[PDB]
Amino acid sequence: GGRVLQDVFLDWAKKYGPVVRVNVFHKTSVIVTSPESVKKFLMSTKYNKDSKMYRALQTVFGERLFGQGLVSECNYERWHKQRRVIDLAFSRSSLVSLMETFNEKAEQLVEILEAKADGQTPVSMQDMLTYTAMDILAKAAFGMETSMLLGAQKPLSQAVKLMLEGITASRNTLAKFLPGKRKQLREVRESIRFLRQVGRDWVQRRREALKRGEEVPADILTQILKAEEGAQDDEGLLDNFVTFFIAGHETSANHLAFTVMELSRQPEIVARLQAEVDEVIGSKRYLDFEDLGRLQYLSQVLKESLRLYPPAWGTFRLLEEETLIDGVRVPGNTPLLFSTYVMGRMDTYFEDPLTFNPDRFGPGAPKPRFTYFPFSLGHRSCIGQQFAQMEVKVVMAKLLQRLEFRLVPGQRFGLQEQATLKPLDPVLCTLRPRGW
Numbered sequence: 001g002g003r004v005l006q007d008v009f010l011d012w013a014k015k016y017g018p019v020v021r022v023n024v025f026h027k028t029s030v031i032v033t034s035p036e037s038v039k040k041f042l043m044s045t046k047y048n049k050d051s052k053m054y055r056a057l058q059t060v061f062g063e064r065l066f067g068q069g070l071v072s073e074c075n076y077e078r079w080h081k082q083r084r085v086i087d088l089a090f091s092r093s094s095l096v097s098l099m100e101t102f103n104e105k106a107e108q109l110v111e112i113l114e115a116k117a118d119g120q121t122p123v124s125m126q127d128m129l130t131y132t133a134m135d136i137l138a139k140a141a142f143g144m145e146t147s148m149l150l151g152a153q154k155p156l157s158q159a160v161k162l163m164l165e166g167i168t169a170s171r172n173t174l175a176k177f178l179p180g181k182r183k184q185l186r187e188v189r190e191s192i193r194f195l196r197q198v199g200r201d202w203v204q205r206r207r208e209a210l211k212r213g214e215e216v217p218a219d220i221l222t223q224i225l226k227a228e229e230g231a232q233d234d235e236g237l238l239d240n241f242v243t244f245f246i247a248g249h250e251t252s253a254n255h256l257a258f259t260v261m262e263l264s265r266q267p268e269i270v271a272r273l274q275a276e277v278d279e280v281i282g283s284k285r286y287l288d289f290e291d292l293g294r295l296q297y298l299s300q301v302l303k304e305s306l307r308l309y310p311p312a313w314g315t316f317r318l319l320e321e322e323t324l325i326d327g328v329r330v331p332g333n334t335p336l337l338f339s340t341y342v343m344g345r346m347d348t349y350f351e352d353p354l355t356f357n358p359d360r361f362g363p364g365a366p367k368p369r370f371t372y373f374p375f376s377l378g379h380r381s382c383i384g385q386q387f388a389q390m391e392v393k394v395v396m397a398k399l400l401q402r403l404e405f406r407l408v409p410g411q412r413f414g415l416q417e418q419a420t421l422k423p424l425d426p427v428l429c430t431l432r433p434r435g436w
């Protein structure tokens, strides 16, 4: 069964009102599920991330993973310094110029799949979408080619896989430390060091090029380095390398996987997606930036996919002074937990919440008001939002143009939780070419 901790929180939120104490963490924390509260705490620089919660990202099993990178830096000043600089890499011109990378990798994904489109060969969409998102990220952020889509870098994607399973366990055990052997523990440490070392090398390869007076176009890497000029160590730079290395591919992959998974049982939705893709791009191969804006219906489908299946389920702020929240006195020094997964599944905020219905986001439908935030909100919202929404439309658009998917019998629709929420089963499918 693929219930996650988020599902328990949901149960408790429906039953116990909009402020609920939990005791699964470092502390009595409080899960906060009223829209007004979401607005209050997220939409204000006055509230900041809980350093105690994000320590699980800082280091893992004694090994430095995300450090004080852009996600896990809780101190506002130190965080604003990083964010000002790194923001330059996500300008509109910065993103428009990634379209070629997004197209190249999307195209390459589809060809690999058309090569397997006999209707018998089982293919892990979760693996495939992961390879694609990784190849996009490496090229787009770091100027490097991983070619996982071409069977390359098996150790790299092994290190990522273990690091992530490692995060799952780093939360837990829990009496389960006698059974789950030292093998897993040191493999995770190995993996985490593998990742930092890839960072060291790609920082090297980059510095080498600049030293030969070579011309390097402005980059996420360019901006992470610049955020680090003056530092005694490269250690704050590696934090940011690893953060972007994982954040910039894993959750885009989960989102793609959930979308393909859910679409496999929504034939009407699929037909309408096909109809839209036919009129916007036809059978043309490259999608321009202007084309993405016109995939209106595809936007709604993805928004709806993020409402039921948000990979990044929420966030935590620290409540420093005792405050009254929805009629409940909550003491100072208390961690607040926000969940877009929880709120998206409450019939209080969404009629018939288990029905996948993209019309909820149709033009003219009032936007959800603090009941939906798959990219978080306020100052600590996702820097990579537009980047993600772009690449995901590029991939999904191409799949829809050329392929049809059928989920392999015995594949489940349920969730697991690693660093993020993702499908429990890979998304094993057989494929045919569109029109069969």
Ligand SMILES: CC[C@@H]([C@H](C)O)n1ncn(-c2ccc(N3CCN(c4ccc(OC[C@@H]5CO[C@@](Cn6cncn6)(c6ccc(F)cc6F)C5)cc4)CC3)cc2)c1=O
Binding pocket: 024, 025, 026, 027, 053, 054, 056, 057, 066, 071, 171, 172, 173, 174, 242, 243, 244, 245, 246, 247, 248, 250, 251, 311, 312, 382, 384, 419, 420
């Ligand atoms: C027995 C022991 C016992 C005692 C000792 O008795 N004990 N005592 C205390 N606890 C304890 C304490 C704490 C927990 N927590 C449970 C989980 N928590 C947690 C924190 C942060 C989270 O952030 C999620 C990231 C955010 O962003 C993403 C997504 N994303 C955005 N853009 C792109 N990707 C992201 C970022 C960067 C990347 F690089 C990749 C990513 F995907 C995902 C999520 C969860 C904290 C630990 C549990 C138990 C015990 O168990």
Ligand code: HEM
Binding pocket: 070, 071, 083, 243, 244, 247, 248, 249, 251, 252, 255, 310, 311, 312, 313, 314, 315, 316, 373, 374, 375, 376, 379, 380, 381, 382, 383, 384, 385, 387, 388, 389
């Ligand atoms: C569809 C996939 C994506 C979703 C659902 C997602 C969602 C989120 C959310 C919920 C936050 C977490 C904030 C918190 O812990 O409170 C966030 C932050 C962040 N994400 Fe994304 N994201 C995705 C893709 C991107 C990609 C492509 C990148 C990089 C290119 C990335 C970069 C980051 C970083 C650096 C932050 C921290 C920003 C800051 O605190 O200033 N994400 N993401």
